[PDB]
């Protein structure tokens, strides 16, 4: 019974993978980029199945030119004892062989076997280092990404740095985008993983991300640079970038991604004084995962040092687990600035004695120093009158008749014009 | 069937500060027990208080005797006879509502009522269960079942008769209540239905009008609400019937905040004992404060805190504290000065508000279209 | 039926007096208007607050100094009224386009 | 023109909602488009002309 369903699923996966391979060949046919992302778009869904019989049948069907590269997977591959070329001996397209080796790697990967996957990924990159075809650049991006996924669980990311650097430079010379985006994201993860934040930041400043890169890679790069500038103290640009990335983040999947992004945007916001919205603490896929950070935010909004200390002592393992323990140190030291922020938003003017009373500062001079530091940054706009003691805020002039709407509208209309122009350029009429 | 919430909201679930754990409420519940004998209200009682008293089994004896007698009657008339459709089997189900629902649990009666729903065809039985397990989901806190019943009643059942689902907003009156559901549609159908009650099973008309007032003033502050709740006829008659809530409404309408605050405290206190209480009583009593404050700030440019206290009840210092925690929420647009003691209102004019709303709705649409243009054309 | 009716008439005639006067003025002290209208400060203050709150008389009260201000709201806002509603109209258009993308 | 754009956009939304339940088988879209074009030219010309009038027709 189970064998029958397994055979039917093997046949349907064989046909789907055959569709993928034919898609590679009619993508290499027509000499055009694209229609290969149509090939690689659903490798997660097909990699969901990845049975042994279908892989062996695909190997025996599309590697009819039996080479040593096919004879290296066979030792580790477990071929069925009892068990299709869609047919002559035409030499295999390098894109096709790279893709087939990719699925072989991914099957060998999902089965918790890492070392042989490490070697096989290494031999996949040693041959991909020889090809100079754009048809093997979009495929090569995903080969690189799944290769680094193979390597990640083997805890050997440092050795890959030289290879990723070399291939990123190769992509930049050839003006690659998908390979460039994947390599840049992966190498930023490499730098941050070994806590080389200075190195990653310096690399970021001299590297320009391609605007044509796919949405998910753009979101990854935005996340990486946002983390870099958040631990680099560029909080405003940090929150802007993570909000952008969450707008670009997938709605359904990437639960871990959205969880980490939510955690770091929460800490960045309350470091800047902004309070995260409660609704993001309510979705089931995020509720219990942010429950430590939810208690964090509860203590931050309450601001009591006792509950703050108990929350820290109870969740410090979670705080460092995301590389935010120093971040939460600065959080614990910026809650006072946050408090001053709502104090000044509520009050147009307030005596520093009243500041110390509402904030428990125990001194008017301490309140003066703290409020001066806070107003140094762009947290509060005011005009301190020490003649009498005023913290008189700037007159809230009419936003209209102030040229600010004109600038915002100019930026927005430029955005719409670029969107329209890119859309009209992307009409892409066919030949026949 | 089970009207007075079985007191379970106030009996031993409203203990501590309101202290209602043993009182005349216990006697009322045990009166609704000795007639229509119950061990279902004893579920939390077997754990907390009134667990294993002598009466629990000294009444168990003839409660079980009577209930086997009645279910045996239902059986013998269901098996010896072959009554079809709306039949003695339905009598078994409704008895088992007065019984096993009000003997031991709902679940078996859920099985029975679902089976008879598959058996019976007409809408009266399914609406009977709608309100049965609606009130059950008030007792045992079920909501997915209730909303399933409401969707069935409206979308597909409500192609013959009508007029009955309206008072079933009680569940929406307490579904999302702390958010939107204590009001809006929870008022517009109460306001739609207040003229024609016709649902004395669920609650008395007086309590219905009190609930209608409570949801109406939170739904509508002064968006010409006077045309619907103040100038309304039946509402005015029952407010003549209930002076307290009448004062509570008219004080807000007539800007008598000094007495409106006392009325708000009174309604909050009597409000802590309802199906309404647990979810949103904090939310209601904060939101009404917001509404009254913002009502005064409107038609006002800058106010001395002394007149703030004097004309809006009391509490110069209390008004700074409350108004501060409320502006910090972003609502009630006004900027306040210290010992100069000026409260400058900074509500944007319709033009600047329109510009801000443009920025917001634009940015949302631009985000959506940017995502679309990015997924499309790669 | 004559106490309520005459109370309503008294309120209405108070309103008519307060609009028929103050037309010459744009910024007049509440003391001046009360002495010209013969009410207490608190009662006339409450009446003016009620009048503006009912949007019967456009203005705003600066009790921080104790003055009534007068202005008008320009109706050019109709273009923005159209603009925002058209914005969410195109938003629903974009949602339908999103569904058409799901087709692809 | 913005009111006409309102009504044309409502018609566009309704037509596009029909489009999904429509395999290949006055469009609100075109009329919308020339309304957009006329608003474009009129408004941009008015803004630019007013600004040049600010510059060249100057007291100095």
């Amino acid at each position: 019974a189970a064998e029958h369903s397994q055979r039917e699923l093997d046949t349907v996966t064989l046909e789907d993978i055959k569709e993928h391979v034919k898609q590679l060949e009619k993508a290499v046919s027509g000499k055009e980029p694209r229609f290969v992302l149509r090939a690689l778009r659903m490798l997660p869904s097909t990699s969901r199945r990845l049975n042994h019989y279908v892989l062996y049948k695909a190997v025996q069907g599309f590697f009819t030119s039996n080479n040593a590269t096919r004879d290296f997977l066979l030792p580790f591959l477990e071929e069925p004892m009892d068990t299709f070329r869609p047919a002559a001996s035409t030499p295999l397209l390098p894109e096709v062989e790279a893709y087939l080796q990719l699925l072989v790697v991914i099957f060998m990967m999902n089965s918790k076997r890492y070392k042989e996957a490490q070697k096989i990924s290494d031999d996949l990159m040693q041959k991909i280092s020889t090809q100079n075809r754009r048809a093997l650049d979009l495929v090569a991006a995903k080969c690189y990404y799944y290769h680094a996924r193979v390597y990640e669980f083997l805890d050997k990311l440092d050795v890959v740095r030289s290879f990723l650097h070399a291939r990123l430079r190769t992509a930049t010379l050839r003006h690659d985008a998908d390979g460039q985006a994947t390599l840049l994201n992966l190498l930023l993860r490499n730098y941050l993983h070994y806590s080389l934040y200075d190195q990653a930041e310096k690399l970021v400043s001299k590297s320009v991300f391609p605007e044509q890169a796919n949405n998910n890679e753009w979101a990854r790069y935005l996340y990486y640079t946002g983390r870099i500038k958040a631990i680099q103290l560029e909080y405003s640009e940090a929150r802007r970038t993570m909000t952008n990335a969450l707008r670009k983040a997938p709605q359904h999947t990437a639960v871990g991604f959205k969880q980490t992004v939510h955690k770091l945007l929460i800490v960045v916001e309350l470091l800047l004084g902004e309070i995260p919205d409660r609704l993001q603490f309510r979705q089931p896929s995020l509720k219990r995962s942010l429950m430590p950070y939810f208690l964090l935010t509860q203590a931050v909004r309450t601001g009591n040092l006792a509950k703050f200390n108990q929350v820290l002592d109870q969740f410090g393992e979670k705080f460092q687990a995301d590389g935010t323990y120093t971040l939460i140190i600065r959080l614990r030291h910026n809650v006072i600035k946050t408090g001053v922020r709502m104090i000044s938003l509520s009050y147009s003017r307030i005596s520093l004695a009243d500041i110390a009373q509402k904030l428990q500062l125990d001194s008017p001079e301490d309140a003066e120093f703290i409020v001066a530091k806070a107003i140094r940054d762009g947290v509060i706009e005011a005009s301190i009158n020490h003649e009498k003691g005023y913290v008189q805020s700037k007159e809230m002039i009419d936003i209209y008749s102030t040229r600010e709407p004109q600038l915002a509208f100019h930026q927005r209309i430029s955005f719409c014009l670029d969107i329209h122009n890119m859309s009209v350029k992307a009409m892409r009429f066919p030949p026949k | 069937p089970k009207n007075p919430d079985l007191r379970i909201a106030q009996l031993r679930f409203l203990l501590s500060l309101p202290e209602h754990r043993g009182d005349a409420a216990v006697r009322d519940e045990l009166m609704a027990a000795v007639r229509d004998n119950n061990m279902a209200p004893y579920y939390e009682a077997l754990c907390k208080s009134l667990d294993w008293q002598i009466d629990v089994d000294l009444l168990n004896k003839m409660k079980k005797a009577n209930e086997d007698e009645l279910k045996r009657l239902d059986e013998e008339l269901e098996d010896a006879e072959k009554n079809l459709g709306e039949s003695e089997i339905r009598d078994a189900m409704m008895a088992k509502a007065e019984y096993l629902c009000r003997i031991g649990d709902k679940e078996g009666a859920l099985t029975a009522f679902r089976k008879t729903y598959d058996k019976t065809v007409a809408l009266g039985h399914r609406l009977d269960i709608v309100f049965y397990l609606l009130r059950i989901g008030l007792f045992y806190m079920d909501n997915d079942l209730i909303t399933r019943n409401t969707e069935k009643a409206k979308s597909l059942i409500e192609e013959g008769g009508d007029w009955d689902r309206r008072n079933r907003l009680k569940v929406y009156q307490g579904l999302y209540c702390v958010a939107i559901r204590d009001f809006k549609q929870a008022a517009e159908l109460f306001l739609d239905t207040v003229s024609t009650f016709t649902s004395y099973e669920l609650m008395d008309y007086k309590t219905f009008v009190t609930y209608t007032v409570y949801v109406s003033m939170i739904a509508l502050e002064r968006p010409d609400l006077r045309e619907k709740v103040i100038k309304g006829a039946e509402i005015l008659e029952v407010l003549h019937s209930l002076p307290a809530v009448r004062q509570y409404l008219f004080s807000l309408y007539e800007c008598r905040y000094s007495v409106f605050f006392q009325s708000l405290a009174v309604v909050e206190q009597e409000m802590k004992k309802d199906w309404l209480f647990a979810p949103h009583y904090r939310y209601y009593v904060r939101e009404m404060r917001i509404h009254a404050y913002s009502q005064l700030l409107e038609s006002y440019r800058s106010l001395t805190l002394g007149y703030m206290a004097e004309a809006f009840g009391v509490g110069v210092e209390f008004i700074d504290q409350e108004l501060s925690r409320f502006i910090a929420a972003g609502r009630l647009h006004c900027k306040i000065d210290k010992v100069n003691e000026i409260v400058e209102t900074n509500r944007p004019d319709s033009k600047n508000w329109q510009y801000q709303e443009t920025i917001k709705k634009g940015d949302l649409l631009l985000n959506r279209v940017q995502k679309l243009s990015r997924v499309i054309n790669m | 039926i004559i106490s309520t009716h005459l109370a309503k008439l008294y309120d209405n005639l108070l309103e008519q007096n307060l609009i028929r006067v103050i037309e010459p003025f744009s910024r007049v002290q509440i003391e001046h208007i009360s002495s010209l209208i013969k009410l207490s400060k608190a009662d006339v203050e409450r009446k003016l607050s009620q009048m503006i709150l009912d949007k019967k008389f456009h203005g705003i009260l600066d009790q921080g100094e104790g003055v009534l201000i007068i202005f008008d709201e320009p109706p050019v806002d109709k273009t923005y009224e159209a603009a925002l509603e058209t914005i969410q109209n195109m938003s629903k258009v974009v949602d339908s386009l999103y569904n058409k993308a799901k087709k692809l | 023109v913005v009111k006409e754009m309102l009504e044309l956009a409502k018609n566009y939304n309704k037509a596009v909602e029909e489009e999904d339940k429509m395999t290949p088988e006055q469009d609100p879209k075109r009329h919308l488009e020339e309304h957009v074009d006329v608003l474009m030219t009129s408004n941009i010309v008015q803004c630019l002309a007013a600004m040049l009038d600010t510059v060249v027709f100057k007291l100095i």
């Binding site: 009409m427 009429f429 | - | 058209t86 258009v93 058409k100 | 754009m5 474009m40």
Partner: peptide, 30 residues
Amino acid sequence: YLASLIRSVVALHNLINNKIANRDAEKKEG
């Protein structure tokens, strides 16, 4: 906002229709 965003949405709508039309033409042709 009005005409420019409307034009952008219209252009995107014209885009996706072609992308379906091209996809449908390809499917009619494997």
